[PDB]
Amino acid sequence: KPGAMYRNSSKPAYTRREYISGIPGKKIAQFDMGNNGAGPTYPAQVELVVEKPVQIRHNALEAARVAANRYVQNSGAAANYKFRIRKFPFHVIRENKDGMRAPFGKPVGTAARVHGANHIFIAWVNPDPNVEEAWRRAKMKVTPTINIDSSPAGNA
Amino acid sequence: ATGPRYKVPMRRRREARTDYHQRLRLLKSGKPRLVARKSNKHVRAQLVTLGPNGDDTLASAHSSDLAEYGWEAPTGNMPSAYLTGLLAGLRAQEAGVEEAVLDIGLNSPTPGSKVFAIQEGAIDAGLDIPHNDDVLADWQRTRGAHIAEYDEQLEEPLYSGDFDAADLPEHFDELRETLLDGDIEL
Amino acid sequence: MHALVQLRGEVNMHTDIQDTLEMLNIHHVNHCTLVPETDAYRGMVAKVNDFVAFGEPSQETLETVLATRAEPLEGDADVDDEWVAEHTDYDDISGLAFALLSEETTLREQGLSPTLRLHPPRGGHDGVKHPVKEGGQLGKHDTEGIDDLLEAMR
C-alpha cells in the first residue's frame, strides 16, 4: 500500500493495545546501532530532522534505517560510531479491505508520528561524517523533506 | 506520604481520637452532646454544640473541681464519675441546655461503665438524655459500695494515706446531697 | 473614552457580536458611538474589535464631528453652541466634547441621540480585511489615526 494512505495525522490516536488486537509485529530490526557498548561521548553528533509532521510506517522506518546503517559500513562492521532511531511506531493503522457498510478497518500495520522539527535519527562520530551521506540515503526513504543537522561540531 | 496520590487521614483520625462515623450519626440528632471522656486519674463531662469553626462547650465538669464541694476521695472511680456527670448536668441546666445525646467517644459501651454513670448523673441533673436503665450500674455500685466491700477484704488499707480507713460511699451521699441545691459555680 | 465606528456590515456577523454593537447603540455601518473606558465596556469593544474602528479622538475632532453629525434624542433640530447651551449642562460644543472625553457624561444623558451617524470616509478608508497594524482600518487606532478617519467621515 502507498504512504499516501497513512502519512497524514488525520485520525485520532489509536495505540491502546488493551482494546486493539492482532497488530502486526514491527519490521524495525534495531534502535541502537554502532558501538552501543560505549556512551555518546563523541566529538561530533549529527542528526536527521524531519521537516513536516507525519506518520512514518515501520515499513519506511526499517528501509531508511537500513539504508543509512548498512551504508555506515564505510566505517566498518564494528566501527567507531553510534546510531539511534529514537522513534517507535505506536500508532496502529487499519484498512477497510459490504462496501462502506460496517467499514471499520482491520489492523494492517503500525507507524510513528513525528512532528515537524523532531529528530528521528541521531549519530555520534569522530570527524568521520560519512554519516551525512548515510542520511541522504535515509531521508531518501521517508515521506517528508528533511534537513541534516550537525549538533556539536565547530570542526568545519 | 509516599507521593502525590497518597491519602493522609483527617488529623483527628491520624491521632486516633475521633470516630467520625459515630460522630456523624451522633450529630444527626441535632441535639447537644454529652461528651463523656475519662483518664486514669480523672473524669470529664462536657456539653458540646456544633459551631462554624469548631464545636462549642456550653457547660462541663471535671472530677478535679469536685473537691471544691467537699470531695476528699480519689477521682477515678464510679462515685466520682456519677457526681461529675451531675455537676456538668446541673451547670448545663443553668446555661439553658435542656437535652443531650451521650458521646462516649472511643470508649466501650460496657454495662455499668463510668461513661454510663456520667450519663446517669447528667440525667439526674434534669437533662433529657436518650438512655437505657438496663445498662446503668445498680446505684449501690455508683455510690462506691463495690470499693468499700473491697476494703473489707482489707489486710492493708486500699488507699495509701488519703482519707478514712474502711472508706465511705456515704461521703458520696454527702456530695450528691451538697450538689442538688445552691452552691456557687452552678 | 473611545470612538467606536462600525465599518463592517451585519451579514455573516456572529449574532452575539452584532447584539453587542446594538447594545453600544450602533445599528448601521458607519454609525459612531462614544464609549467610556470601563472594564465592562472594554470587554464589549474587544468582542467587536474585528468589525470596528476605535480609539480616543482629539478634542478638536470630537468637536467637529459633534457639530457636523450630532442630533437631538428626538427631532431634526440643529445641534450648535446655541442648542447645546440652551439644552445641555454645557455652554458650547467644546464644553460638551470635553465632558464626554473626561467621561463625566454621555450623549444620551444630555438628551442627544447616542449615535453619531457619519458619512462614508472621503477618499475611502484603509480596508476592512485587515487591522491597523497590517495596513487595514480595523481595530484600535492612534489618536492621530482615529482622527484621520472621523475627519474623513465628517
Binding site: - | 491519602k7 493522609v8 467520625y20 456523624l24 | -
Partner: protein, 95 residues
C-alpha cells in the same frame, strides 16, 4: 450515548481527586440552610445517598423548605423550573 442511565458519562464528575478520597467530613453533611438561601449543587463522590440527578451538578439553586432532613432546592433547567431533593452533603452556600 450508547446507553441512557442516570450515570451515563459521569466518569469524571462523580470521581474524587485522589486526596479527597475516603469518608468526607460530617460537618457539611449536617450544615443547616435557610429558605431563600442560594446554594451550589455538587454531588460528593464519597457520599452515597441524598444525591440528585448528575445532570444537575453545577446548578446554583434557592433553598425552599425541606422534606425530612433533605432539602428542597429550586432551580431552572434550561427554561424549565424543577425542584430538587438534596441532602446537605451535596450542597455549599454561595459566596
Amino acid at each position: 450515548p450508547s446507553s441512557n442511565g442516570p450515570l451515563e458519562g459521569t466518569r469524571g464528575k462523580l470521581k474524587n481527586k485522589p486526596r479527597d478520597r475516603g469518608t468526607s467530613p460530617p460537618q457539611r453533611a449536617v450544615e443547616e440552610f435557610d429558605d431563600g438561601e442560594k446554594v451550589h449543587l455538587k454531588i460528593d463522590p464519597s457520599v452515597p445517598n441524598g444525591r440528585f440527578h448528575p445532570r444537575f451538578d453545577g446548578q446554583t439553586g434557592t433553598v425552599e423548605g425541606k422534606q425530612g432532613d433533605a432539602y428542597k432546592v429550586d432551580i431552572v433547567d434550561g427554561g424549565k423550573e424543577k425542584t430538587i431533593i438534596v441532602t446537605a452533603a451535596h450542597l455549599r452556600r454561595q459566596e
